[PDB]
Amino acid sequence: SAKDERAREILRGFKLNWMNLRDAETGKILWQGTEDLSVPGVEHEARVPKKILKCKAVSRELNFSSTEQMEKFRLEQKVYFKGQCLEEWFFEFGFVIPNSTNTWQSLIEAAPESQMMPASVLTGNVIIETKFFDDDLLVSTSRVRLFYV
Ligand SMILES: COC(=O)[C@@H](N)CSC/C=C(\C)CC/C=C(\C)CCC=C(C)C
């Protein structure tokens, strides 16, 4: 469309290879996926162990490939509970070499146990909406429904 064919070019050349969730304090891998949760237009599912809610902070690794150059690769994540936006996250990777494969690590600090909701209430009710950007270029929007198992 009129909005850059480059955005569509980046998307066709972009692949999310795998993703990790780690205990930020110990480095134990708590959850791993190899499904491209960045694919737009379908509601992905993620089933993560309930024990993750025990962590004070988690480290999320995104390993991605991109045939296309990007000047300022970043993402915006809204966390929804039953359609209510609870959290808005911003993460920047920066410059993406064309044809590169990159591991992207981010630290997610957890809310206190006394302020965070139980797994039984959260599971199936949390939607993460991720917008993938090259600076101001919206490359894709993806939605993942969270289950705590
Ligand atoms: C430690 O307590 C917490 O902070 C709990 N509430 C969550 S830890 C963190 C994150 C997740 C669980 C889900 C992370 C996001 C996923 C799997 C999907 C995002 C999609 C993309 C493509 C980045």
Our measurement of the distance from residue 37's CA atom to the centroid of its chain's CA atoms, rounded to an integer in Å, reads 8
DSSP code string of 85-148: EEEEEEEEEEEE-TTEEEEEEEEEEPPPTTTSPPHHHHTTTEEEEEEEEETTEEEEEEEEEEEE
CB of 138 within 8 A of CB of 7? Answer: yes
CB of 132 within 8 A of CB of 142? Answer: yes
**Nearest ligand 1 atom to alpha carbon 54:** 1
Does any ligand 1 atom lie closer than 6 A to the CB of residue 48? yes
Q: Give the count of domains, the chain.
A: 1
Which residue minimizes the CA distance to atom 15 of ligand 1?
128
Task: Name, in order, each residue with C-beta under 8 angstroms of 138's C-beta and a sequence gap of 6 or more.
Answer: 3, 7, 131, 132
The distance between the two most distant Cα atoms of the chain, rounded to a whole number of Å, is 49
Specified resolution (Å)? 2.0
CB of 24 within 8 A of CB of 57? Answer: yes
**What determination technique applies here?**
X-ray
Domain that holds residue 139: 1-149
Which residue minimizes the CA distance to atom 12 of ligand 1?
48
Q: What is the CATH number of the domain that holds 146?
A: 2.70.50.40
Phi-psi category of residue 104: left, alpha or beta, with phi > 0 → left and psi -120 to 50 → alpha: beta
Q: How far apart are CA 60 and CA 145, in angstroms?
A: 17
